Ligand binder design. Structure first.
Ligand SMILES: Nc1ncnc2c1ncn2[C@@H]1O[C@H](COP(=O)(O)OP(=O)(O)OP(=O)(O)O)[C@@H](O)[C@H]1O
Ligand SMILES: Nc1ncnc2c1ncn2[C@@H]1O[C@H](COP(=O)(O)OP(=O)(O)O)[C@@H](O)[C@H]1O
Ligand SMILES: Nc1ncnc2c1ncn2[C@@H]1O[C@H](COP(=O)(O)OP(=O)(O)O)[C@@H](O)[C@H]1O
Ligand SMILES: Nc1ncnc2c1ncn2[C@@H]1O[C@H](COP(=O)(O)OP(=O)(O)O)[C@@H](O)[C@H]1O
Ligand SMILES: [Mg+2]
Ligand SMILES: [Mg+2]
Lengths: 50, 1622, 100, 100, 50
């Protein structure tokens, strides 16, 4: 989801969540939050978020 | 003719031998007489086995074999029958005598009903035909008994909650195991079987006394034999239920002890305050009452005497009758000393010793009181003393005695204590008593702390026993968790007993915190007991434990003895520590204890002896050298003093025995007067301390003895008969026996030393470097004792560090609280139960392995005076007197002071086992044991005759070994590794002579040819056994030294080392170069994984490997990665048919479980009359376990690798322990080959010397420039026959490769980056890559070939580089080497820097323009966006190069990628795009927060089913973030290296895999039905189809740890450093 | 160079020794063996010299490097001091028969 | 060497307020702590958890649980711990620290 | 120190023998270690794990 790995096939936009594919609506948006300012994030998570 | 007599006797025995039956409760006829039946079967089996040795056995072979079979079948059936019967018995008693269990457990009751129905039908069938033969002929009786055993066991494990509910009734059952509790409950009627369990439930009750009917309990007995008669007997008939009459027995025991004390006091009061004591009346009084009661009465009488004196002195200035109390104690002590000087019955002697100790304390206290002018009974220096007030007017007998110390007051518990050792009452002991009694009065726990061996545990036990309390010691470890501690607390609270937890800081800190609240609530319950407001006629005091309301008896206490000085111990939280009162116990009074013990044992010079022995121990501690196995503490002195007492008694007995045969003037007083007490003490000191000393310390300790004990000499008793028995055993085991200074004399002395250590210590260690004759010493001692004493000796050898501690000691189930025995627990419990007469045999439990505090400290209560193994389920197992705990170790650098002080010591030096002894052993086995399975024996005897002159003292081999120790070797050098390699090579030479005789049946080899062959082969074998693990220059050094010192003829070549020669069977030195022809390789297997170019190193290493392997000797190949170790081993195995190799790839996390899974797949376990045998599934085949990284697996903090210990156990002992049922499994047709890098490499650990002594090591270095030129020169000549016009370029191209490779191997090393390893593997890949780019080409100019060469160099060398300057250097030096070896070419057409090759724009892999490739990649990404992933990508040059590299790797079998770069660089996206370009399905594991190892295993099974069964090409793309555990990487390492996971498919999964592989192989047109062949095909399909792409971020520490964690990732995967965007 | 008898005359810095306890016990054992006494029958007397290199009795051993913390020693006479450490030039340890 | 659990117990005794005290080490300790906190937040009851520094991972989840909670005004949660770097920073910021 | 039949009876010689033995062992180990470190720092011998 954070990588925006969408598959557009058969007029359908699919996002693969776990083992299940879901029709992704264009109006979806996600905000990740934390209350700890000192938490360290791994570089892979840092590359996928703003 | 006598053999037929033996067969006839066996036939007549079993034609009439009937199993003996006995009526059981009119319910059936059970079988008794097990010992007789088993002994008869065993001795007939022994006779049948022995008659095979006779040369007349053949005529009677068949029948004899038949009988053997029958005997074994018998030995099968009844070996089950008994257990079944035993179990059934108590199970029946449980399902018939209790009607509540039927409603409580209906399903279990009905299951047991069916089981008992079948059991009784079998009983009736046995009753009709009691003959053993017909019982054995019952149809399916074996399977019937096996099924009955399984079913009865299941019912047993089902009855657990019933066991708990019954434990609630009689709380002492809380300290009895489930097996024993079932046996007690089910055998309530047959009370005799209860006897063995009383010592579990009582402090001193070892057995109960029963009337003739066995229906009335008349009294109780101790282990020694002391008996107490109940004042009123307890009738079992009146109270049939077992817990009821057990409670009555306990109450009557307490009341009887109270009444006996009431009588003992009123009789001893006469002895007190009396001027003179008649010895006869005194000794009669001591004999009349129990030792506990006698000491208690003496303490009382002294107490009221002192009270009367102090009350009389209330006037202050009045006369002091305290002197009269002193005088009475003096007179009584004089009588006691006079008694102990003369011989006494042992029980009476121990009573006298206890009386002496107590009255010595009383004398000291009275002297202190008189010295300080004490005249008031309320003064504290009297109140601080422990006082005893007895009030006969008290109505309750249990309350007549009160024990008071300071303000603390206690009631005597009246627990029967039997006869127990009582401590010397030292000032430290007085302080301990005072502090602990103050803690008890405050309802606080006690906490003695200090270094090991100071008396903490003993002091707590002595305090409890002085109060008549049942004291229970627990050897705490990390498995004593919250629930186990809670259950133990419940048991002690309901019983009212004292709990002493030693090593209590070995619990986890969280568990200590959790246990604190149980301790707090129990302490509150004790305080409500103290509350006077509380009345005894009210609700019983109760606290909440484990969410249950548990009654708390006021007599219980909780004590913890610990050592804060040990590092790694858990710190106690403050809230826990405030619940305990702590006392430091650091400096025990050694002199006082020594004096009191010597005075009580009867030594007249006790003062002088103690004043000499204690400073002697100090001088031994300080003057003698420092060794880890040295202890001169309180335990050592205590052992010496007890031994001195024993030696004094045996010397008095010997003196009177000599007097019997010389007159009759036997006066015990005269013997006491003329008795060498100092000589006795010297004898004890020597027998206890001499075996532990190193050679240089023995004269030091003798000089100390002369200094402290002048004129006293110690002489060992000449133990002849034992020495002839050991000599016979040495003769029959090919061992060297010597006497004194002869060869083997030191080892024989060490054997004798171990013998007298076994007679004084139940726990002992033999410590000495690997190869010191230790194992042979104890084994030969065991056999000699078996022959001399008639007692069968059985040894259980455990490698405690080859298994987990849970598998060693056992596990308490977290949920069901069910206990599973460990290996040592199971063995000791089997010995204790004595189902098959284990208690009548000598039982030696030998821990042959490394000692560390984690596992050995669980034996602290076993090795000390407790002799108890304490388990976290509250069970304690007593060590039987016939059991010795032994440790066979090479060092003790990780053992602590407690373990060292808790075990006798025998030190073995390297000088104990001389090299001549080893040579004699080898030559004796050569001359006696034939190698074939006699002409072969004749050949061996002749070879031994030839080799004997070189195997003498200061001979050829000894000098060679001495010189080789000075040489440098890739591993540590040990004597036995070289000697074993040499002996195996000589055995191979004997087999070579035999095979030559086979080739020439007409003219066998003569003696002269044999001599010339054997001498040269001995030189050759010495060379390869002493320098085969070293580099070339060391080999030349050893060879030239041999040339200097040898008389054997040698090659006359001037500058060629002897190591370059073999020995032909005609006894001539022939150069190895004669077996290295210049081969021309067929063009289609150029640089193939199987092709090997013959070289001097290849031919020599292959021959040595053949020699070691054909003997099944385990071996290790060591060398730099890519040195050709695996290649050489496979080449050697190709010359060995009937050998199947199986490759295991070790990582840092490798455990024995990998080997176990490999055995599960490739081998089978089978029952044989001699045990479990693990053998390869394929018959007639020897299986080689090839471990590729044997020295990588993690070394723990105590220097032990578990898998190395396990492999050592398999190699030396021929097997291991199956931990599911704790059974010994013997290996058959399984050998071991390991490969490794030098231990100095990062992540590599040195191998244990005990492992190396069995394992010859061969050093395989990188091929030198000439060898590389020759090998790859042949490859190039083979490959460039594709284009004839390029033939003349074979030599330059190879040269170029070599030069560049060499330069690369110099420019980039592991110091810079952990993955900068370059080996001939790069050269092989270079040749293969050029060859693949040449096959479909009809012609090519030289510039095109140079372009291919440069492109392959860039792919192989530059792609792994991290820094830009390294890549620049590689790029420039490619041009440099290219133009150095290939002049007269156009530079631009061959070295145009954008060197790109592809097969995307053409059928063939040809150079591709960057712009055309860019257009093609854009066109393909256009389709890729709409078909797989709609993520637009910006396309730059590095992306094009990266996708070309990924395509190259995806077009190779087992093509695995290690993409290292910053996150977000597009590694995964590019991998998926290239996989889509190649028709590869992309697989990624869907990691979530709850993703575990089982999920990864299922994903691996899915991907392997798709890749190996469905022939689907899958790119398994996985990131480092996907690795949630190290097991993921352990699975991935094996999958990368071999394309198979040994344990991934098990059970139904394996059957489904077999079905799918069958249906997939039938689709491929192959005829495969066998599971092995189908699995091999599946592995090959996985190899060719699956491509693993590992993605990870650059991290120096992370990458370095990654190399050790998953080695295959750096040698089976192509590494691509994408890094960050430039 | 001189034999083992020269070990008794040499002054020893107790701190430099790896195990000074063993040195003290060895000196006690030496004195007890010279007079055929026991270790427990010897008591230790301490003499502090103004300068090193003094007359060593057969039962006396020289020790250097001892640092007196909290006191000063004049004429084998201790007095309370406000200084942290005071160097003791040479300490003669003499093992003599105990008169209790 | 110092422990403030006794201070909390004495404080609860003086205020005549009931308090449940739990050691944190055991898993049953975790379950009892959760139940006691859930009961106390609805009744003003006092909860004390001792040696919480031994369970930092559980401490983070405890902080997250406490953040989304509106307990009774009289409810008080005491967390006794050693001065340990393993204690989570978020818990330290959420609560008020007293050094003993 | 050289062991002698009459030197073994001297407690001072015994203690000093222990002293000199352990001191010589430690001295040899430390000197060899420092020489190896020097040779490493001159780029003449390869760095082992120890
Ligand atoms: N008395 C003897 N005379 C000759 N050879 C002997 C004698 N005793 C043992 N050996 C041989 O010498 C070797 C001694 O092996 P042993 O197992 O006794 O040594 P160890 O010190 O216990 O070994 P490890 O330290 O590996 O456990 C074996 O090869 C054995 O056969
Ligand atoms: N007062 C004493 N009298 C006699 N022997 C004692 C006495 N105190 C301790 N010991 C002995 O000291 C040894 C170690 O005692 P133990 O309780 O195991 O010490 P610790 O708990 O400090 O390891 C044992 O041999 C024990 O019998
Ligand atoms: N005589 C030879 N013939 C063919 N290849 C050789 C020869 N000597 C060395 N090699 C090469 O050396 C490398 C050895 O690889 P490998 O067997 O994995 O080494 P190791 O077992 O030391 O890790 C391969 O590239 C192999 O082709
Ligand atoms: N060449 C590229 N063009 C466009 N975006 C890219 C490119 N390489 C990486 N990215 C970015 O990185 C994201 C993740 O790509 P991925 O292959 O998962 O990277 P990595 O393997 O480095 O973790 C993409 O969704 C995109 O936002
Ligand atoms: Mg103890
Ligand atoms: Mg051994």
């Amino acid at each position: 989801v954070l990588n925006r790995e969408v598959r557009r096939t058969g007029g359908r936009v699919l996002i693969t969540l776990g083992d299940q594919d879901i029709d992704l609506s264009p109006s979806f948006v996600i905000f990740l939050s934390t209350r700890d300012p000192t938490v360290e994030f791994p570089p892979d998570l840092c590359s996928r978020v703003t | 003719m006598a053999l037929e007599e033996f067969l006839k006797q066996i036939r007549e025995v079993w034609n009439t031998y009937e199993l003996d039956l006995v009526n059981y409760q009119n319910k059936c006829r059970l079988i008794r007489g097990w010992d007789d039946l088993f002994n008869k079967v065993k001795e007939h089996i022994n006779s049948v086995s022995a008659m095979k040795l006779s040369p007349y056995y053949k005529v009677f072979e068949e029948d004899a074999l038949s009988w053997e079979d029958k005997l074994n079948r018998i030995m099968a059936l009844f070996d089950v029958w008994i257990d079944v019967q035993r179990r059934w018995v108590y199970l029946e008693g449980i399902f018939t005598g209790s009607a509540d269990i039927k409603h409580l457990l209906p399903v279990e009751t009905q299951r047991f009903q069916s089981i008992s129905t079948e059991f009784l039908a079998l009983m009736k069938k046995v009753s009709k035909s009691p003959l053993v033969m017909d019982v054995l002929n019952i149809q399916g009786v074996q399977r019937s008994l096996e099924r009955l055993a399984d079913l009865l066991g299941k019912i047993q494990k089902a009855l657990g909650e019933y066991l708990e509910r019954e434990r609630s009734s009689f709380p002492r059952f809380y300290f009895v195991g489930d097996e024993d509790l079932l046996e007690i409950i089910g055998n309530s009627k047959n009370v005799a079987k209860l006897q063995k369990h009383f010592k579990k439930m009582f402090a001193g009750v070892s057995s109960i006394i029963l009337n003739e009917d066995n229906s009335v309990v008349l009294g109780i007995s101790s282990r020694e034999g002391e008996e107490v008669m109940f004042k009123t007997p307890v009738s079992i008939t009146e109270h049939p239920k077992i817990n009821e009459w057990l409670t009555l027995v306990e109450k009557e025991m307490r009341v009887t002890l109270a009444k006996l004390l009431a009588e003992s006091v009123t009789e001893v009061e006469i002895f007190g305050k009396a001027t003179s004591i008649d010895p006869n009346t005194y000794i009669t009084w001591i004999d009349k009452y129990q030792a506990q009661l006698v000491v208690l009465s003496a303490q009382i009488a002294w107490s009221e005497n002192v009270e009367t004196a102090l009350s009389s002195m209330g006037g202050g200035g009045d006369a002091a009758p305290l002197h009269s109390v002193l005088s009475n104690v003096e007179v009584t002590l004089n009588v006691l000393a006079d008694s102990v000087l003369m011989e006494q019955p042992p029980l009476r002697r121990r009573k006298l010793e206890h009386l002496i100790t107590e009255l010595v304390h009383q004398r000291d206290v009275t002297r202190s009181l008189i010295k300080s002018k004490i005249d008031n009974a309320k003064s504290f220096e009297w109140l601080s003393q422990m006082r005893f007030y007895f009030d006969p007017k008290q109505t309750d007998v249990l309350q007549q005695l009160s024990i008071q110390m300071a303000n603390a007051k206690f009631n005597y518990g009246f627990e029967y204590l039997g006869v127990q050792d009582k401590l010397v009452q030292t000032p430290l002991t007085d302080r301990c008593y005072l502090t602990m009694t103050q803690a008890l009065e405050a309802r606080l726990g006690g906490s003695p702390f200090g270094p090991a061996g100071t008396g903490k545990t003993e002091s707590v036990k002595a305090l409890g026993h002085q109060l008549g309390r049942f004291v229970l010691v627990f050897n705490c470890d990390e498995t004593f968790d919250f629930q186990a501690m809670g259950r133990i607390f419940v048991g002690l609270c309901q019983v009212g007993a004292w709990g002493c937890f030693d090593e209590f800081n070995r619990l986890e800190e969280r568990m200590l915190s959790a246990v604190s609240q149980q301790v707090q609530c129990i302490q509150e319950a004790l305080r409500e007991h103290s509350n006077p407001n509380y009345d005894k006629t009210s609700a019983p005091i109760t606290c909440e434990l484990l969410n249950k309301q548990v009654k708390v008896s006021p007599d219980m206490a909780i004590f913890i003895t610990m050592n804060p000085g040990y590092a790694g111990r858990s710190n106690l939280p403050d809230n826990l520590k405030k619940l305990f009162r702590s006392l430091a116990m650091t400096k025990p009074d050694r002199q006082l204890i020594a004096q009191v013990m010597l005075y009580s044992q009867g030594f007249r010079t006790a003062e002088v002896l103690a004043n000499k022995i204690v400073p002697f121990f100090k001088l031994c501690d300080e003057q003698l050298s420092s060794q880890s196995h040295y202890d001169f503490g309180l335990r050592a002195l205590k052992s010496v003093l007890v031994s001195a007492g024993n030696v004094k008694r045996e010397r008095i007995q010997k003196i009177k025995r000599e007097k019997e045969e010389r007159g009759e003037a036997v006066d015990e007083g005269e013997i006491a007067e003329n008795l060498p007490e100092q000589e006795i003490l010297i004898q004890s000191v020597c027998e206890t301390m001499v075996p532990k000393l190193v050679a240089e310390d023995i004269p030091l300790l003798f000089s100390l003895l002369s200094d402290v004990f002048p004129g006293v000499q110690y002489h060992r008793g000449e133990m002849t008969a034992l020495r002839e028995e050991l000599k016979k055993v040495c003769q029959e085991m090919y061992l060297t026996y010597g006497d004194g200074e002869e060869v083997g004399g030191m080892w024989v002395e060490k054997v004798l030393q171990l013998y007298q250590i076994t007679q004084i210590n139940h726990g002992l260690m033999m410590v000495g470097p690997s190869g010191s004759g230790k194992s042979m010493a104890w084994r030969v001692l065991l056999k000699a004792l078996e022959r001399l004493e008639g007692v069968e000796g059985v040894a259980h050898i455990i490698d405690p560090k080859a298994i987990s501690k849970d598998h060693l000691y056992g596990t308490l189930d977290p949920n069901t609280r069910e206990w599973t025995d460990g290996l040592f627990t199971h063995v000791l419990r089997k010995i204790i139960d004595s189902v098959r007469g284990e208690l009548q045999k000598r039982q030696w439990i030998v821990f042959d392995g490394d000692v560390d505090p984690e596992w050995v400290e669980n034996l602290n209560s076993v090795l000390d005076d407790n002799k108890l193994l304490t388990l976290p389920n509250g069970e304690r197992l007593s060590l039987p007197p016939n059991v010795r705990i032994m440790f066979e170790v090479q060092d003790l650098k990780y053992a602590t002071l407690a373990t060292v002080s808790r075990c006798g010591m025998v030190w073995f030096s390297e000088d104990v086992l001389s090299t001549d002894m080893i040579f004699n052993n080898f030559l004796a086995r050569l001359r006696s044991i034939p190698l074939d399975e006699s002409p072969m024996l004749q050949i061996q005897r002749d070879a031994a005759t030839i080799m004997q002159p070189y195997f003498t003292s200061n001979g050829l081999v000894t000098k060679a070994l001495e010189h080789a120790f000075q040489l440098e070797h890739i591993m540590d050098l040990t004597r036995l590794r070289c000697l074993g390699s040499l002996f195996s090579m000589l055995h191979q030479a004997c087999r070579n002579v035999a095979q030559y005789n086979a080739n020439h049946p007409d003219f066998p080899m003569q003696i002269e040819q044999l001599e010339r062959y054997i001498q040269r082969y001995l030189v050759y074998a010495i060379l390869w056994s002493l320098s085969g693990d070293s580099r070339l220059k060391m080999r030349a050094e050893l060879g030239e030294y041999i040339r200097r010192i040898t008389t054997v003829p040698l090659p006359t070549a001037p500058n060629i080392p002897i190591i370059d020669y073999e020995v032909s069977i005609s006894g001539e030195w022939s150069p190895w170069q004669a077996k290295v022809p210049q081969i021309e390789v067929e063009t289609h297997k150029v640089a193939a994984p199987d092709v090997v170019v013959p070289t001097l190193d290849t031919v020599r290493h292959e021959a040595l490997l053949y020699t070691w392997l054909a003997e099944h000797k385990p071996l290790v190949l060591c060398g730099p990665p890519g040195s050709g170790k695996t290649m050489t081993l496979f080449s050697a195995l190709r010359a060995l048919p009937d050998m199947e190799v199986v490759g295991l790839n070790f990582s840092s996390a490798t455990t024995p479980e990998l080997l176990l899974k490999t055995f599960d797949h490739y081998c089978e376990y089978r029952r044989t009359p001699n045990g479990v045998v693990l053998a390869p599934v394929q018959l007639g085949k020897w299986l080689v376990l090839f471990c590729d990284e044997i020295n990588l697996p993690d070394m723990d903090k105590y220097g032990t690798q578990r898998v190395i210990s396990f492999i050592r156990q398999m190699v030396e002992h021929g097997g291991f322990y199956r931990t599911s049922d704790q059974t010994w499994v013997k290996l058959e047709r399984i050998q071991f080959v390991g490969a490794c890098n030098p231990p100095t490499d990062p992540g590599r650990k040195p191998l244990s010397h005990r492992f190396l002594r069995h394992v010859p090591v061969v050093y395989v270095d990188y091929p030198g420039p000439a060898s590389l030129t020759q090998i790859y020169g042949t490859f190039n000549r083979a490959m460039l026959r594709l284009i004839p016009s390029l033939r003349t370029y074979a030599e330059p191209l190879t040269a170029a490769m070599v030069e560049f490779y060499t330069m690369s191997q110099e420019r980039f090393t592991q110091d810079t980056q952990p993955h900068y390893i370059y080996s001939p593997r790069e050269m092989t890949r270079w040749v293969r890559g050029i060859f693949e780019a040449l096959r479909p080409l009809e012609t090519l100019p030289v510039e095109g070939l140079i372009r291919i060469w440069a492109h392959e160099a860039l792919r192989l060398f530059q792609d792994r580089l991290v820094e830009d300057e390294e890549r620049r250097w590689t790029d420039e030096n490619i041009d440099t080497v290219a133009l150095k070896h290939f002049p007269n070419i156009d530079r631009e057409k061959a070295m145009s820097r954008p060197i790109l090759y592809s097969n995307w724009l053409s059928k063939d892999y040809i150079p591709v323009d960057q712009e055309e490739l860019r257009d093609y990649v854009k066109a393909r990404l256009k389709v890729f966006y709409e078909e797989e992933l709609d993520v637009p990508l910006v396309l730059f040059n590095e992306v094009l190069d990266h996708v070309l590299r990924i395509d190259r790797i995806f077009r190779q079998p087992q093509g695995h990628l290690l993409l290292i770069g910053v996150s977000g660089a597009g590694k995964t996206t590019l991998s998926r795009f290239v996989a889509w370009m190649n028709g590869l399905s992309v697989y990624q594991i869907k990691v979530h927060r709850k993703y575990t190892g089982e999920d990864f295993d299922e994903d691996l099974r899915t991907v392997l089913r798709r890749s190996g069964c469905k022939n689907e090409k899958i790119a398994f793309i996985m990131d480092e973030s996907n690795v949630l555990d190290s097991g993921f990487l352990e699975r991935m390492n094996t999958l990368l290296a071999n394309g198979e996971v040994p344990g991934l498919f098990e059970g139904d999964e394996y059957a489904t895999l077999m079905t799918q592989c069958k249906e997939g192989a039938q689709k491929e047109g192959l005829m495969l039905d066998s599971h092995e062949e189908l699995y091999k095909w599946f592995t090959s399909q996985v190899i060719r189809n699956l491509h693993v792409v590992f993605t990870m971020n650059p991290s120096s520490e992370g990458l370095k740890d990654r190399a050790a964690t998953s080695p295959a990732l750096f040698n089976r995967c192509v590494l691509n450093w994408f890094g960050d965007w430039s | 160079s001189g034999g083992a008898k020269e070990l008794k005359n040499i002054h020893v810095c107790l701190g430099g020794l790896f195990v000074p306890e063993a040195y003290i016990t060895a000196t006690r054992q030496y004195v007890a063996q010279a007079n055929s006494w026991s270790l427990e029958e010897l008591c230790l007397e301490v003499n502090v010299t103004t300068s090193q290199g003094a007359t060593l009795d057969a039962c006396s051993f020289g020790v250097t490097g001892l640092k007196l913390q909290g006191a000063t020693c004049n004429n084998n006479k201790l007095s309370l001091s406000n200084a942290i450490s005071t160097a003791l030039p040479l300490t003669q340890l003499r093992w003599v028969k105990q008169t209790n | 060497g110092y422990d403030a659990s006794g201070h909390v117990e004495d404080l609860a005794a003086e205020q005549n307020t009931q308090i449940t005290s739990i050691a944190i080490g055991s898993a049953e300790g975790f379950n009892q702590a959760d139940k006691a906190i859930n009961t106390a937040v609805k009744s003003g009851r006092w909860v004390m958890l001792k040696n919480v520094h031994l369970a930092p991972g559980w401490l983070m989840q405890l902080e997250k649980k406490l953040h989304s909670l509106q307990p009774h005004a009289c409810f008080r949660l005491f967390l006794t711990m050693e001065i340990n770097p393993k204690v989570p920073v978020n818990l330290l910021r959420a609560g008020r620290i007293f050094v003993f | 120190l050289k062991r002698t039949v009459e030197n073994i009876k001297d407690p001072l010689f015994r203690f000093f023998e222990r002293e000199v033995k352990m001191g010589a062992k430690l001295l040899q180990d430390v000197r060899q270690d420092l020489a190896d470190v020097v040779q490493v720092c001159e780029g003449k011998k390869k760095q082992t794990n120890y």
